[PDB]
Amino acid sequence: VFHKIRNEDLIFNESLGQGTFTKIFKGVRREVGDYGQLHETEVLLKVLDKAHRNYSESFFEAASMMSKLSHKHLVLNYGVCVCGDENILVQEFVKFGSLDTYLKKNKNCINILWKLEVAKQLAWAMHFLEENTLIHGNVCAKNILLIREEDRKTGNPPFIKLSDPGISITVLPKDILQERIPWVPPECIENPKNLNLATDKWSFGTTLWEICSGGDKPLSALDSQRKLQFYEDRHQLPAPKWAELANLINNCMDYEPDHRPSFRAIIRDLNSLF
Numbered sequence: 001v002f003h004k005i006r007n008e009d010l011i012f013n014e015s016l017g018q019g020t021f022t023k024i025f026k027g028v029r030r031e032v033g034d035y036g037q038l039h040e041t042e043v044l045l046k047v048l049d050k051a052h053r054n055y056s057e058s059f060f061e062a063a064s065m066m067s068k069l070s071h072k073h074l075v076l077n078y079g080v081c082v083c084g085d086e087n088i089l090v091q092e093f094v095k096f097g098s099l100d101t102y103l104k105k106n107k108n109c110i111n112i113l114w115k116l117e118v119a120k121q122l123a124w125a126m127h128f129l130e131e132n133t134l135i136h137g138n139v140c141a142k143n144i145l146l147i148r149e150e151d152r153k154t155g156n157p158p159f160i161k162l163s164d165p166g167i168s169i170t171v172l173p174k175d176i177l178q179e180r181i182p183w184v185p186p187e188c189i190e191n192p193k194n195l196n197l198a199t200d201k202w203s204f205g206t207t208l209w210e211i212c213s214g215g216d217k218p219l220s221a222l223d224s225q226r227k228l229q230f231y232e233d234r235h236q237l238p239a240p241k242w243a244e245l246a247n248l249i250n251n252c253m254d255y256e257p258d259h260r261p262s263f264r265a266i267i268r269d270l271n272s273l274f
């Protein structure tokens with residue numbers, strides 16, 4: 001199901017961070033490309049923790065489901081490595097990394113048309129998954145990767161890709177799900193079996209908030225318990241200073257899952273502004 005990649009062809013380099021029960025490294029893979037030519041291609045290496053090996057089922061399924069579909073806005077997986085005592089995903093290395101760190105580093109420089117253009121690309125990706133009834137389950141700005149920046153010469157827009165969702169929130173512990181508030185929908189915080197395509201409409205709304213809030217994290221100042229009570233009080237995220245998308249955020253973040261707008265209608269609202 002996954003292309004098998006040789007240990008000897010994978011050189012692990014610098015730590016780039018970590019996700020849920022994973023460590024992330026920038027890497028180097030030696031490979032025969034097209035025409036027989038040998039390449040040294042940089043790769044991203046996602047290693048499942050040596051202590052949480054029980055989650056390997058979901059870990060690789062999440063990369064597997066995305067990999068079965070091919071789309072310009074979904075990150076490419078090259079495969080796994082036959083290491084034995086390790087579980088390593090070999091994924092495409094995106095030049096500029098996660099969108100949330102990028103938005104911090106350019107707070108006072110991303111204008112509204114940049115945020116709009118990134119929102120349309122993400123909504124296009126989500127609509128694609130929706131047509132295929134594939135649930136992502138972890139839509140956030142950390143899982144958005146910037147392939148290219150705005151070519152202020154050609155006025156060329158930024159291009160983004162959506163990374164894999166990682167271990168499902170259906171098997172992950174509550175504490176993890178409660179720290180993922182307000183990306184994890186209230187219904188999944190009440191019962192993780194509520195994971196549905198509507199979950200991705202809620203998380204897209206929270207991502208749109210992050211894209212409009214210069215790398216700021218929603219409910220960061222709130223501890224797990226207070227975040228849990230934010231949902232019990234049916235509260236809504238504060239409107240971003242750049243409030244050109246606050247209505248779409250509130251419409252996508254509807255406490256009633258079946259009232260959440262389709263990605264087709266979201267794209268139409270995104271195209272109506274400007």
Ligand SMILES: *S(O)(O)Oc1cccc(C(=O)n2nc(Nc3ccc(S(N)(=O)=O)cc3)nc2N)c1
Nearest residue numbers: 016017018019024044092093094095096097163
């Ligand atoms: S999550 O899994 O914690 O989010 C996450 C963390 C690290 C890497 C990735 C990821 O999927 N990915 N990142 C890159 N490229 C990249 C480029 C530059 C940096 S930086 N700012 O630290 O210099 C980081 C990462 N490519 C991929 N596939 C997800």
